[PDB]
Amino acid sequence: HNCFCIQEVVSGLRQPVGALHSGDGSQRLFILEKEGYVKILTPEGEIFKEPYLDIHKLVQSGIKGGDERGLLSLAFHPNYKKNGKLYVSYTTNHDHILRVVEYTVSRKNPHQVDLRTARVFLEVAELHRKHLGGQLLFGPDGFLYIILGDGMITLDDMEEMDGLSDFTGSVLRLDVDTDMCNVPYSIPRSNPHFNSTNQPPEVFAHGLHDPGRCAVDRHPTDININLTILCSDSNRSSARILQIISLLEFKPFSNGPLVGGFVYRGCQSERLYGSYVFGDRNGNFLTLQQSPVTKQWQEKPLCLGTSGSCRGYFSGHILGFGEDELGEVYILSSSKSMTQTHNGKLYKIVDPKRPLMPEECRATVQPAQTLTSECSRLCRNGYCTPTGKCCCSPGWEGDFCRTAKCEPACRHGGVCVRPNKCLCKKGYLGPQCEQVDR
Ligand SMILES: [Cl-]
Ligand code: NA
Ligand code: NA
Predict the structure, then answer these.
(1) Do 335 and 32 contact (CB within 8 A), yes or no?
(2) N or C: lower Cβ tally within 10 Å for the chain?
């Protein structure tokens, strides 16, 4: 009598890999498709016909099972409501490269990102097509964590090939909130290699092999602990943890290989609040609890059962998980039958013991607005940083890169119209208007 149940929410996805919201109040859910798409699902349950992001041309997907290449992850800037910034990680065309790129939603349309605004941050080289990782997330510190798998690169493979990474197998951590204009991302002071020119400054921890989706506790009440990141891993199946006030390798699981996990922070289940949930491909879930007393970890199983329309099974295999803005969680699934007809699916987890909309859970949809920041309206000739800093293209300047540069200057009422281009009035001639007619 303690089971949870599963509700189908949408079908007809193409090989979904996960889903998340954008923290802008709009209760939109962004569904990632592996071939390279992000679709929008409204709180009313419509899927928009135009992708929010369509980069299937840049991304090298993959056909075989086990071929982990495609769109990997998506993270929205913590202040996206204002700056319209998002970060994606995909694999593109030494087998391939794993980019991590910043994009900016379009200025004219809240529901489509401006493909022109790409702004690459990392490019990690890859020899194989497994153990990639790619999970992006923002901690409450405001920094950008990137969990990378070892790419199954050996120490052999690393010493006899220059142009590898030192990044693979690691949790990197960046400060995207830079005012600098010459390097894409700053580096946190707290980093365990700030300025150190031996081990790479981005790295914040390492030794991950084949991580799944990693649970992320943001400790809203817990004032002592800042962020905990808990990862399933194979190579057989084990956990790895990270707490912030360099990672520890236990094994609380006693069965097969997990897809990943999540920390439930929703409102609809009371019983489940704060729990760490992990699941496998076939939908056997478990919870993890730390003993306050001994700090040891225990798996309790968590079961599914039918309760009305809300079933105790779902079809296909789990590929990923999803969390909406209200904190409710989803399963993304597909099969070999499912994937051939684009019938991947989004299911919601429900606590049948509680109402679907308890008084405490109501919330008012705040419809996504056109980008409004100062930097967005004015910075034409360059690019904005997340902080509002306009970073001029080459040959421009001024606060918002509005005024053009000419070395040398324009003369006889000339006018520096675009970089090294003078408008001469009628009658002076030349590159800089320096010669007079006749
Ligand atoms: Cl907490
Ligand atoms: Na949203
Ligand atoms: Na805190």
Answers:
(1) no
(2) C
